[PDB]
């Protein structure tokens, strides 16, 4: 189904970026940026400034370890989905 | 992108079922059941007993109004995605 395809897409895209550098199960600043710029180009403005990268990570980093884990990525997805939902 | 397609799939499948009966922005017991049975047939066991329907709603119903709204649906999706993530 389309729902099951959406579940596996969330897992795959996270790992496409998290496993690039350092901890393979977390997104660092540069990995989060590329994910937003390449995969969310219709929902979000392209990030071109360092302070936007820093602010976005600050917002998503719930436990405060400097990176975005899978749970925090899921919360980010929930935010975008809710913002898009309320648009209509 | 695949991620953006996943975001719109979550919104669409929720409304496919929530808008069937009663409140068009919330899932009642029978609507939640059909969503699980039709759209999550590879991730979850088919619900065939009433007490399984009742228990699942009890688990998902965070604010305690008897139904599953969009925020609660997103938390449900997060649960399944995390369970599938940890499987590998
Ligand atoms: C600069 N933009 C271009 C992408 N946009 C957008 C694009 C398509 C459909 C809906 C939205 C609307 N709204 N919100 C989100 N995507 S979070 C708006 C922001
Ligand atoms: C009775 N089942 C059939 C569907 N399953 C399943 C199917 C495919 C890939 C991974 C899982 C594994 N694990 N978890 C979830 N889907 S939440 C297991 C449960
Ligand atoms: C850790 As690699 C070689 O997939 O960027
Ligand atoms: C409320 As209807 C007619 O789409 O089931
Ligand atoms: Ca990483
Ligand atoms: Ca973190
Ligand atoms: Ca309803
Ligand atoms: Ca509720």
Please report the resolution in angstroms: 2.0
Residue B36: count of CB within 10 angstroms of its CB: 22
Phi/psi of residue A29, each to 5°? -50, -50
Q: B-chain residues within 8 Å CB-CB of A2? A: 9, 12-13, 39
Q: Is A12 annotated as a binding residue?
A: no
Q: Which residues make beta-bridge pairs with A27?
A: A68
Q: For an interface test with B, give the residue of A12, A36, A81 to mutate (most B CBs within 10 A).
A: A81
Q: Which residues line ligand 1 (CB under 6 A)?
A: A 42-43, 45, 80, 83-84, 87
- DSSP-derived secondary structure for B22-84: SSTTSB-HHHHHHHHHHH-TTTSPPP-SHHHHHHHHHHH-SS-SSSB-HHHHHHHHHHHHHHH
- Spatial separation of the C-alpha atoms in residues B20 and A69, rounded to whole Å: 36
- Looking from the CA of residue B42, the nearest atom of ligand 2 is 4
* From the candidate CATH numbers 3.40.50.300, 3.30.9.10, 1.10.238.10, 3.40.630.10, the one assigned to the domain spanning A1-88: 1.10.238.10
- C-alpha closest to that of A36 among A72, A6, A80: A80
**Experimentally determined by:** X-ray
Contact call for residues A81 and B74 (beta carbons, < 8 A): yes
**CB within 8 A of B44, min separation 6: which ones?**
B36, B80
Beta-strand ranges (E) seen in A1-88 are: none
DSSP 8-state code for residue A60: H
Nearest residue on chain A to B25, judged by CA atoms? A85
| Domain ranges for chain A | 1-88
């Amino acid at each position: 189904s389309e729902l099951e395809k959406a579940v596996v897409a969330l897992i795959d895209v996270f790992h496409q970026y998290s496993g690039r550098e350092g901890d393979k199960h977390k997104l660092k600043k540069s990995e989060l940026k590329e994910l937003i710029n390449n995969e969310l180009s219709h929902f979000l403005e392209e990030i071109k400034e360092q302070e936007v990268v820093d602010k976005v990570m600050e917002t998503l980093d719930s436990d405060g370890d400097g990176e975005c884990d899978f749970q925090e990525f899921m919360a980010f997805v929930a935010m975008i989905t809710t913002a898009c939902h309320e648009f209509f």
